[PDB]
Design a protein around this ligand. Structure first.
Ligand SMILES: NC(=O)c1ccc[n+]([C@@H]2O[C@H](COP(=O)([O-])OP(=O)(O)OC[C@H]3O[C@@H](n4cnc5c(N)ncnc54)[C@H](O)[C@@H]3O)[C@@H](O)[C@H]2O)c1
Ligand SMILES: NC(=O)c1ccc[n+]([C@@H]2O[C@H](COP(=O)([O-])OP(=O)(O)OC[C@H]3O[C@@H](n4cnc5c(N)ncnc54)[C@H](O)[C@@H]3O)[C@@H](O)[C@H]2O)c1
Ligand SMILES: NC(=O)c1ccc[n+]([C@@H]2O[C@H](COP(=O)([O-])OP(=O)(O)OC[C@H]3O[C@@H](n4cnc5c(N)ncnc54)[C@H](O)[C@@H]3O)[C@@H](O)[C@H]2O)c1
Ligand SMILES: NC(=O)c1ccc[n+]([C@@H]2O[C@H](COP(=O)([O-])OP(=O)(O)OC[C@H]3O[C@@H](n4cnc5c(N)ncnc54)[C@H](O)[C@@H]3O)[C@@H](O)[C@H]2O)c1
Lengths: 334, 333, 335, 333
């Protein structure tokens, strides 16, 4: 049940994709990587990680490859995906991690370069969009290009699904307090057209737009147009948290909300539970897409009116990557 | 009244003096009580990690600070009752230690010779003032009053404007808030509070606040209608409060923003921006709260509507401007 | 039939990491008691959740008077004064003194009054027997009762200094360590005893800081006694630090010759590592060495006969130092 | 020459304009070249994460900024040779991009119709000026010159003082330096430089710098006598330079301190402190360097002696004060 994989964009997500596949001893063989740099620099960045520490396997490079745990992985440096020589090592499924091919029409260039399927590590417009253990049963053997949405969608979606299923969500808004990422800036300076993105990320609370709630109907069709939200980007290197304020279809207590969620996390490798008073560094390295936090649940009620606040943590790097890999393994088998 | 003692010469305490002198007030700080030496209080007054060098000359002797040429006595009584407020003639005590946060406790200050107490924190069930929301509840008989928390001074003007314009029926707040001294630098015990034990500059840390819970003291019609909490994050000062409300009227973002723009007009306490600011831009603000029209969001499904409004606050210096606005008035009664 | 029962006094950053490392290495040493100033509940929470190293790798539960760690019960006491700790209840023999409040022989001998047999102090503690493992642990003997492992900084500096002095001679030197902030500092600007600089917000400043690592190096390397001075610059990283030594040596060297001597001193040495990779401080986090010499930073400045040599070593001032503490403890326990 | 253009409207570029306005310079900034829209440049000028709100008005058009009411043309030419400096008559270009740090490269601004270039960084073997150390060497016929680095502006006045008083025979420097835009926010490729590829706000990152090696361009008698390097650390601005020297005379610390105190007297570029300051206290400094008497250390064994001296610098605003001093003189020759 092998399938050969190529990684396009060996960055925070792309490097963690290899990390995780070796960690779970996946049957997937990673045979090629495409980025914009030398094998040398990619070896350095794979070996040493500011968030997750030394790579658990050996790493070397040659003039045109990485040698990871004694296995050779070709390195290419093609700016445009249609020029990547994917057939040279039979890379059949591309894990598209650059941020620059987030649509069907743009990821087509990997199929034109000779791959069979593309799994995109970000929202990619109206395409099949999977949160593993929420809607992965919609994957079938005709799918060629799919998205796993954002970290934030993988955090939000299981909480939202559980609340919808148990109580119905009539309307809600989300705020995620999110670690800073590579889309931001180190010192104040231009960052494309987003003004807030131009600002020094480790020195500010920065409001930030995200489509996690807005496009939740790709993942949970029943909640199409029922959710909005945004992010506040904050100075932590990884580890994030998602609050959702909802009007539910039934009146509830906090205990009742927590039981329902506990039930949804039972035998669920994607969605965990805590009643410990954890903080974001405690989620770093999580193997869940989302961890519901029963300690932060809140019911505000006056007469026939009730607001329900529910909160879940996520490691927007490694946690999300575990979800991406669950999805890759199923997408490779169909 | 024109003479002030400060108890607790901390982040708040020191900025009080700074603000008074900034506005050339005719209130004079004549005495300070804390736990340390005038050497160390001078060092900290002069050198501030958040606001840079003090704008006036500072010096010290063994029992005093010398600030812009004027002498301020320094005491170090553990217990407020021992403070000789009488010596230098201190009429009003700005209480900033965090340790006398009630009517009974701040009484010690009157016992030690001062007429009135303004507490820099929530302080139970007393007159609790957000200037430019409910400062006209203050009368000449009042002796001991609160200015609530930073978060209170952020939330109350926003809630006031929305409630007057539209009605708030119910809401929940989250403030994404700068770490403060009640937290820990490294992981280790901080009384009984598990989350306050964790390294503050390396974590997003959920935290209890009763700014929403106790909003009734400031806006009596909203009693029991709001709840909320904080997420404490690694910025040294500058914070932001989000309120999700159910309003008594359907609204657009543009309507919400114009009602707020209007409430902020010629309003010393409560400002407005439609610029794409971030937390560092609020550092040194002269408002208690700055409504950010860029973050307004209306989520509507039929007859159901969630309204998210967002306002920034310098939880240090912004809040202090309010404390000093209230102090200026309280000293005239 | 060697000493096998430990008590930890001060279950803090160092104290909790002592237990962690003992379990990691499958030590035959059993931690039977902990003394701190708090409830089992809070110590359990802190042990389970660590901002720097992540989730405890073993099970953690607690009762009203104990912790249960990997299924093994550990008594918890809360005695502010060491002389009242009831060490004899579970038979604690060696105390790992990690509070910071008992940094002398006079102070720490209170644990002996309290029923323990020996004390190992996780910090410099005046002129008592002071051990950097794999530098001068051969000086430790059966009669040693109270001993120090000096600081994180001493455990970083000493093996570099030892190699250099052995190979070339150190005539004189000055150290600066760029060091993670620690609990002795302040979160926000406010009083912190009488040290002015320690009053300043640690995660928002570069803060000069006095350390005796160099001053007191003679305790560990007798021939360098009074030959070194130094200080620290505390900076906003949570853990991971680096020590620079600038020396006048007794011989003209090249950078290559200094690197090869250092390489050789780090061979078959579990305490002292070597690197020639372009690493940064987060890469030293969780290191099992007390010191890692970095050949990339070596620098020889020479004008005629005047020569200055700068050598640089990383250290994880929490975990890496803890590994050294544990190496010394294991030895201590069997003398 | 009164008319200036800025290439690279970055941290240095923007603070150049801010400082010129602050000292009410007679220099007229007429044009700015960068890579982006006047809208984005306006936003960045208005709101500064390190120094707060811009003290003057800022607006924009599709091709200009309006700053304090004055129009500044905005161009977006990634090759300096195509920047149309002749349009508004920009004569002196303040070259702040990092991409033209050599005579051969900056020559392009002259080809593009300017008369002089002042580079905000080391630029090899050309006239390199640390103001109040070697500005006397600036010559009427110089058309391309350097102000070296931040670090060079810190080190040079301290080295000069020590060398003139005691003779510096050999020495080595380490600067513990705030992170800059040459580093990375998250771990990722940053050219060929491996350490620049690492998350700057989460690491101590050793970094090469020529400030010591190139010192001869500023203090010729010290050519080849110094070496050094930096450690980049998680502060947003404000840095400190340590120098360890063998001097030509035995000294005490008071002696070194006194000598340095004397060098700083009446010196707009080179300050002195004997207060226990930390890095945030240097932010917004108007000196190129502030010598710190509190950190001086003399280590002596027999006849050998090592002297450690230490100076703070605001690598952004402090350095820029030097750039401006140099610019004002350069404009008048
Ligand atoms: N928190 C997170 O970081 C996170 C979470 C979920 C999803 N994502 C998404 O995953 C994707 C990558 O995020 P990241 O944080 O890893 O970003 P990143 O900047 O760390 O990595 C991107 C990598 O792609 C390379 N690259 C850029 N353009 C390229 C091109 N044309 N061809 C080949 N390589 C190219 C870069 O050199 C870099 O190595 C983005 O879509 C992002 O939205 C990120
Ligand atoms: N920092 C904020 O964001 C903020 C905002 C609004 C309100 N407040 C409130 O203002 C008060 C002070 O907060 P802070 O951040 O200034 O705290 P802080 O810890 O900075 O300062 C407290 C000062 O009081 C001193 N102190 C402690 N116990 C004392 C006693 N018994 N007698 C005299 N001095 C004593 C300390 O030495 C210190 O200088 C608190 O009640 C807090 O809730 C803080
Ligand atoms: N980088 C480091 O953190 C480092 C490295 C080397 C050595 N050290 C040394 O190790 C010791 C501990 O450092 P730490 O960083 O773990 O400090 P910490 O403040 O994290 O831990 C101190 C612990 O001891 C407790 N404590 C304080 N006084 C007490 C008493 N009288 N009785 C019982 N418990 C008490 C505290 O509650 C806390 O749990 C200090 O001597 C320090 O110098 C620290
Ligand atoms: N601490 C410091 O930041 C510091 C101190 C002293 C000297 N310097 C030096 O000054 C120079 C600028 O540093 P900075 O920190 O301002 O950098 P920065 O990256 O903040 O600014 C660079 C600016 O130049 C622009 N730019 C890039 N390439 C360009 C091009 N080809 N044409 C036009 N504009 C371009 C960018 O968009 C940006 O606005 C560098 O040479 C640096 O070494 C920096």
């Amino acid at each position: 049940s092998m399938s050969k994989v190529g990684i396009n964009g060996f960055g925070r997500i792309g490097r963690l994709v290899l990390r995780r596949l070796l960690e779970v001893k996946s049957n997937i063989d990673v045979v090629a990587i495409n980025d914009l740099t030398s094998p040398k620099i990619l070896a350095y960045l794979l070996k040493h990680d500011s968030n997750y520490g030394p790579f658990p396997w050996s790493v070397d490079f040659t003039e045109d490859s990485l040698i990871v745990d004694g296995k050779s992985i070709a390195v290419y440096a093609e700016k445009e995906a249609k020029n990547i020589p994917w057939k040279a090592k039979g890379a059949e499924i591309i894990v598209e991690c650059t941020g620059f091919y987030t649509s069907a029409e743009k990821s087509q260039a990997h199929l034109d370069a000779g791959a069979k399927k593309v799994l995109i590590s970000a929202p990619a417009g109206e395409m099949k969009t999977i949160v593993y253990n929420v809607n992965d049963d919609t994957l079938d053997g005709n799918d060629t290009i799919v998205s796993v949405a954002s970290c934030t969608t993988n955090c939000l979606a299981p909480m939202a699904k559980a609340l919808h299923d148990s109580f119905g969500i009539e309307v809600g808004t989300m705020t995620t307090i999110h670690a800073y990422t590579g889309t931001q800036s180190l010192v104040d300076g231009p960052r494309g057209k987003d003004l807030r993105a131009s600002r020094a990320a480790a020195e500010n609370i920065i409001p930030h737009t995200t489509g996690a709630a807005k496009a939740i109907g790709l993942v949970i069709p029943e909640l199409s147009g029922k959710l909005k939200g945004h992010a506040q980007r904050v100075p932590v290197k990884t580890g994030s948290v998602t609050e959702l304020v909802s009007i539910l279809g039934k009146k509830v207590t906090a205990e009742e909300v927590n039981n329902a969620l506990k039930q949804a996390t039972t035998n669920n490798e994607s969605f965990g539970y805590t009643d410990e008073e954890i903080v974001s560094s405690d989620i770093i390295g999580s193997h869940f897409g989302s961890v519901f936090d029963a300690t932060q649940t809140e019911i505000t009620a006056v007469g026939d009116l009730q607001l329900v606040k529910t909160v879940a943590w996520y490691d927007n790097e490694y946690g999300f990557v575990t979800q991406l890999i669950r999805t890759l393994e199923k997408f490779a088998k169909l």
